[PDB]
Each structure stands twice: as C-alpha cells, then as structure tokens.
Amino acid sequence: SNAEHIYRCEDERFELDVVLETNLATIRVLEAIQKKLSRLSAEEQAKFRLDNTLGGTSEVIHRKALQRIYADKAADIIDGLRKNPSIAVPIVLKRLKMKEEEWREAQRGFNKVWREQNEKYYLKS
C-alpha cells in the first residue's frame, strides 16, 4: 500500500483541538481582565481583584491550561492572579500569548494541514 498500513490521525488532533480551544478561552478572559486592569494601584488591585473572576464554572479551563504550562508552580501563579492582578496577569498573559502562538504553530502543523488534506482530493489509491 504505502509504508505498511494506513495510519490515520489518532488522538493528536484531540489533544491540540482541546488545548487550543482551552488556550483561546483563557486568552480571551485574561486579555479582558488585563485590559480592565490597565495597570491598577495597590488599593485598586484590592478593589478590582479576581474574587469570582476566572472562577465560578469555567475556572477548570484556565486552571488546567495554567497547570499545563506551570504544572509545578500552578498554585503560586493562581495565587498571584487572586492577589496581584496588575502584577501577575500582564506577565502570565504574555507567557500565555507567546505560548498561544507556539500552540497555533502546532495547530498549523496538525489541525490546519489535516483540514487541507481531508477537504482536498485524497484520490482513490
């Protein structure tokens, strides 16, 4: 046939599709908060703080995404978000944005090319 057997996409897409979706959701929320921050004062970081923000229901999304990049020190970063938003959020977001583009690069390789190959003419061989 080709090499030996037809190796169709396994779980690779699943990992990327989910992690990118999770990424984008966290990208949105952090950029939203960071924009609302616009560098706040100490008393303002006390006033406007992630009390119910990034939590409630969709916390697992950002929590998991953050634990994936900061596995060992996830608590420290989570605490930072729940404490000093105008400090942690800008930094963590910048880490997340560079990682976003890197994940996007991976998505380009797996998901994007998969899109191309699947929608185009695969032929009858």
Binding site: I69, Y70, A71, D72, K73, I77, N84
Partner: peptide, 27 residues
C-alpha cells in the same frame, strides 16, 4: 525534529523567572 514541536510544559527557568518577577515587580 518535526515541523512543529509539542511543548506544553514550561521549563523551570521560565517558571521560576515568573515567580521572581511576580514577588518583586521592580519596574
């Protein structure tokens, strides 16, 4: 090795730097 490298976890270098920055903010 590939066209895209699946790196999910950040290195202790990056992680620790973040922590250093968070607890300092010297800017």
């Amino acid at each position: 090795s590939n066209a895209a490298q699946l790196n999910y976890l950040l290195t202790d270098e990056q992680i620790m730097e973040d922590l250093r920055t968070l607890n300092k903010l010297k800017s």
